[PDB]
Design a protein around this ligand. Structure first.
Ligand SMILES: Cc1ncc(COP(=O)(O)O)c(CN[C@@H](CO)C(=O)O)c1O
Ligand SMILES: Cc1ncc(COP(=O)(O)O)c(CN[C@@H](CO)C(=O)O)c1O
Ligand SMILES: O=P(O)(O)OCCCc1c[nH]c2ccccc12
Ligand SMILES: O=P(O)(O)OCCCc1c[nH]c2ccccc12
Ligand code: NA
Ligand code: NA
Lengths: 262, 389, 389, 262
């Protein structure tokens, strides 16, 4: 729940925008994923968006699909994710952690049991990528019960009824989709209406590449911008030169966060 | 939702929020088409004069010898394209052009829904891309080129596990971009609402022709109608007009693979756990921690690890029984139908036939009128069955 | 002879004297079966409920665009087995068992009459041996194993030139021994009397269903009905009920091969000399000194160097016109029917279609109602057409 | 016509039976086929039955089919056959020559023209293997016009109507079929009925192998026996040892003709 309120509230005074990186837990190995998340934070990441490896990523294009394949070769189960998550929180007590999930992984041993270990591990929000607002009820009711922020997507093709629903249901932040498709490092009116309905701080979606895109997003009305594509490509590229990976990572996060004002 | 998305607890629309306007648009299109006399007129004309409906109901005269089982076969193998897939594909392509759409996406595993999308597109002036996975391309190379000749793009999946499961996913990813020009012609009575209802209403003629045919022939309704279950369209096509005739048993047959105990099977409804995937809540084959596990069958067309929601529901209330049939019992009923009746069945439909032969063989003095749905012909399968020597 | 063996000067029974009692026995069997209500009842039942007759009459809606030609297709491709061959084979196997016979001999070139003999035998309890020649076995390997699975013996001819011609001969040699147990299921409307008459009476339904269908649809009889001519059964099947409707043109199409002028063609009726072979007097392809010369066509099913006698006769009195179509024009009409109508035709039937497309293309403002007989599906042909790239 | 009458009439006094060999003209080469027919005659052949190469031998099984293939490789056309036939007659003026034909070869340039060159070359009878009695009329009328004996087959499965027809139509001799099938060196009541109808001297058909079979045939009522199968196999066997071929030929004809009394 709370960590987000503080971040947006203190970012507000800094007249900064949030820069949330996205990374798959486990890609390419436990120890080395954990060093990537500390390097990200220490380079300027305002919050984290973390994905747990699912076999059938319906909303994820190729980099993230390869990323999942990577944690899967590394042996990262659901439970070793939760084990990493409690470790991240144990050493970074304040940064908001959001989880990017697929529905079956949440449903497996009970929806409520899932939100319960999330609360136990110190996770703040959960976005379930394939549960639309109209099927969300047991998911949002279980998250509210464990003080987990239910994140919803607001797509390009959104209408009023939906905008008021996601404004009434979501908490933490609103994922605002800036394109269509599935994730990749290739390929304003809505924001005001959100702010009229008093929805959570819209962060921007798929298709953020440009450092200036963050700038654009921030003055356009968005409180911050999420990026995963980019971050992962580097993990894929410099995977043989680990120190160099860390280094270029440290560079883009610094570089993107540096662009987070406009 | 004009129509309810759930069959007891199974169903729904568990798709990324962006696809949700697409699904309610299709539901509107379906409901208005269902009431439009010019839609049913165009639909019926295309079923009678292009596809060749009504298909026959053949009595077997030699396989049942020495038992008291009368066995009929509903001849879906005699439909244009060579399988039941064609019926639904004609209805969805008229829905697609009624919604002003112009591209079609589809996925295929035995290749038979690939070929039927390829032919309906060429007929109606729509452009068509298909996703198919590597071991199916191999197992079903006949269908790969029939599809290609009619000018359809086969985009050859091997994004991970390369199978129908993988094709399905790839097809939803693409339609998440394309949905305002392109219609997704989904292959079975599964996935997100309204596709379970639309595919059932567009395969319903199978079971209503069987009912009219057997009553004229036998003067009485079957004791059981039997059909194989990959995701469930031919089976719900068959079962649908009989559901309220309680007398009639409905048996769905799932691939038993190398045998259930091996783990190499493709029988989710009786040996899987309910899960959420491919836009629905339905029994599937998944790891204990919830990864979607792949299935197995000697037949490419039944290699899907979940099943359509109306089936999971008909089982739980006990209106329908679902049974399993190993590779070897399907192969044995393929051989036997050729040799005693001169019909070469598709290996998917052989699973339904091997279960009706079991019923007849275990209890030879039981007087019983059965109907199997011979959902396809086995021309795609002859190269494959020959390489099992 | 109860029925006359000659069509003008073409016909007769030029067989070794030993086979002559066999032919008059079959003629007796045919004539009495023709009058027996239980024969026609058994025949009709087997055509409707096993084979799937009536087949459809499809209107083409896209290939004729921009011309004033309306084109229908008679859907023989939708018959069980995948071709017109099945109709006759059901009637002759009931004649064979009516004469107390128990083995069946047959010959095949596209493999399609092989498969239909294999299926009717398995259905009726007869044992079956087939002769097929080497380049056809190769060109049509699909059909080789469908035939094999239903338990038929493929005796693989290469006694000389290994083709239908050679199969034909080998089949007559064997039946010269076997004729008191075995019936010879000859494949076309050719060879010795009464096979020209029997095969025509057993394919006649093709043309009588077309007449009923077009009159209901168009309110009027075709301007022409078009069919390909290998030895002549599907064509005489089609033409037969129309012969007395003078208004209706009858066009038979023969393989033009690499083009008539190359000498590599398979068009005896318009580019051969009358001769005596295969028990008949009819136009054939022979050397100047009278050796029987082999023919050519890209399609295995039309590679026969003579033609059935009733055709040679319909031409001489000018009631029917016979035309030719090269390999390449058949291939072009195969491609075009897939791509604009979603029907994959057998390469034999493509010869009839390429001639109706020529008629339409040469004279676009001529208003004309045509019917092509789409005698088979092209599933046997897809491997072959793909290897022409 | 006539040569047959003399042969059966003089054989009659010798209380011998006729032994007619069958050979394909041209197999394996012209010159060497011609030496085979002189060796046959000089070894005891009473009459000759000669086959002209046809491409599609409907009534001929494999040896004769290979035999045909052999003359065809040798280049023997219809016309080079007639050329050999006038040469045979020019040096053996008395032996009856019968031709074994297929219908198209006779029909090619006119039925009557064919019987005319037969008469011109000095051939005595023609058997057309695939023209049954019921289709024979232009063939038998053209042969009678050129004093060529029309030969007919009387098969195992013969009835009265046929036996009286072939007795009324044939001349020279009657080919009596002793089996069914097609030619190969593998695989009484009728004769009396023939002799009642006053048919020509029945010679026996396919399936003569045994030297004693000739004997049997002769006392059973047949005036002689035809053999081809055997004769040809030897031509096929000793084809590499030509002199030995001639020799074994000279042997069987002597051997078979030696058995021609009983
Ligand atoms: C003749 C036949 N009968 C039945 C099935 C199984 O599906 P059904 O359960 O939907 O009815 C298939 C598969 N149909 C799909 C899936 O692989 C296709 O794309 O080819 C089939 O090939
Ligand atoms: C679909 C189709 N249409 C037509 C023909 C030609 O014969 P038809 O002239 O007899 O009608 C063939 C050949 N049918 C014969 C000869 O090769 C067979 O044994 O296969 C065919 O395959
Ligand atoms: O465009 P990218 O690659 O920067 O990713 C976008 C970030 C979060 C994200 C990763 N995978 C998803 C699947 C569905 C919805 C959102 C996500
Ligand atoms: O049994 P065989 O080989 O000795 O031949 C028999 C002799 C004459 C003969 C050779 N080929 C034929 C074809 C039809 C009718 C008769 C013949
Ligand atoms: Na399944
Ligand atoms: Na021909």
């Amino acid at each position: 729940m709370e960590r987000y309120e503080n971040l947006f509230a203190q970012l507000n005074d800094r007249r900064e925008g949030a820069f949330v990186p996205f990374v798959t837990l486990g890609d390419p190995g436990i120890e080395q994923s954990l060093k990537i998340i500390d390097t990200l934070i220490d380079a300027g990441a305002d919050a984290l968006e973390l994905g747990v490896p699912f076999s059938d990523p319906l909303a994820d294009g190729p980099t993230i699909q390869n990323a999942n394949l990577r944690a899967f070769a590394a042996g990262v189960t659901p439970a070793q994710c939760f084990e990493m998550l409690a470790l991240i929180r144990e050493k970074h007590p304040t940064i908001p952690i959001g989880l990017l999930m697929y529905a079956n992984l949440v449903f497996n041993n009970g929806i409520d049991a899932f939100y319960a270990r999330c609360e136990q591990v110190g996770v703040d929000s959960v976005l379930v990528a394939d549960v639309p607002v109209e099927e969300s009820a047991p998911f949002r009711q279980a998250a509210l019960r464990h003080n987990i922020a239910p994140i919803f997507i607001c797509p390009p093709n959104a209408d009023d009824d939906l905008l008021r629903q996601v404004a009434s249901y979501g908490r933490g932040y609103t994922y605002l989709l800036s394109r269509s498709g599935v994730t990749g490092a290739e390929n304003h009116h809505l924001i005001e209406k959100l702010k009229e309905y008093h929805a959570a701080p819209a962060l921007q979606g798929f298709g953020i590449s440009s450092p200036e895109q963050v700038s654009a997003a921030v003055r356009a009305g968005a409180a911050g911008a999420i990026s995963g594509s980019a971050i992962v490509k580097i993990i894929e590229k410099n995977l043989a030169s680990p120190k160099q990976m860390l280094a270029e990572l440290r560079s883009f996060v610094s570089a993107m966060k540096a662009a987070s004002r406009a | 939702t004009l129509l309810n998305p759930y069959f007891g607890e199974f169903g729904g629309m568990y798709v990324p929020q962006i696809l949700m306007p697409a699904l309610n648009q299709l539901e509107e299109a379906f409901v208005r088409a269902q009431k439009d006399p010019e839609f049913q007129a165009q639909f019926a004309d295309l079923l009678k004069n292009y596809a060749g409906r009504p298909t026959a109901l053949t009595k077997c005269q030699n396989i049942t010898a020495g038992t008291r089982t009368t066995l009929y076969l509903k001849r879906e193998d005699l439909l244009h394209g060579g399988a039941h897939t064609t019926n639904q594909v004609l209805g969805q392509a008229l829905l697609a052009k009624r919604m002003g759409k112009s591209e079609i996406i589809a996925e295929t595993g035995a290749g038979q829904h690939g070929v039927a999308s390829a032919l309906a597109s060429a007929l109606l002036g729509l452009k068509c891309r298909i996703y198919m996975g590597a071991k199916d391309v191999e197992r079903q190379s006949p269908n790969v080129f029939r599809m290609r000749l009619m000018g359809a793009e086969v985009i050859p999946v091997h994004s991970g596990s390369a199978t129908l499961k993988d094709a399905c996913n790839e097809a939803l990813r693409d339609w998440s971009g394309s949905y305002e020009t392109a219609h997704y012609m989904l292959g079975t009575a599964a996935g997100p609402h309204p596709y379970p209802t639309i595919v059932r209403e567009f395969q319903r003629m199978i079971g209503e022709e069987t009912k009219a045919q057997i009553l004229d022939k036998e003067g009485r309704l079957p004791d059981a109608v039997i059909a194989c279950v990959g995701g469930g369209s031919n089976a719900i096509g068959m079962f649908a007009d009989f559901i309220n005739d309680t007398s009639v048993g409905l048996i769905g047959v799932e691939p038993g693979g190398h045998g259930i105990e091996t783990g190499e099977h493709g029988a989710p409804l009786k040996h899987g756990r309910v899960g959420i995937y491919f836009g629905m809540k339905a029994p599937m084959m998944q790891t204990a921690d919830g990864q979607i596990e792949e299935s197995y069958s000697i037949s490419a067309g039944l290699d899907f690890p979940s099943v359509g929601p109306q089936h999971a529901y008909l089982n739980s209330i006990g209106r329908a029984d679902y049974v399993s049939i190993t590779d070897d019992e399907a192969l044995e009923a393929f051989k036997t139908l050729c040799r005693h009746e001169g019909i070469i069945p598709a290996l998917e439909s052989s699973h339904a036939l091997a279960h009706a032969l079991k019923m007849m063989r275990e209890q030879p003095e039981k007087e019983q009128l059965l109907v199997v749905n011979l959902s396809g012909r086995g021309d795609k399968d002859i190269f494959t069955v020959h390489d099992i020597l």
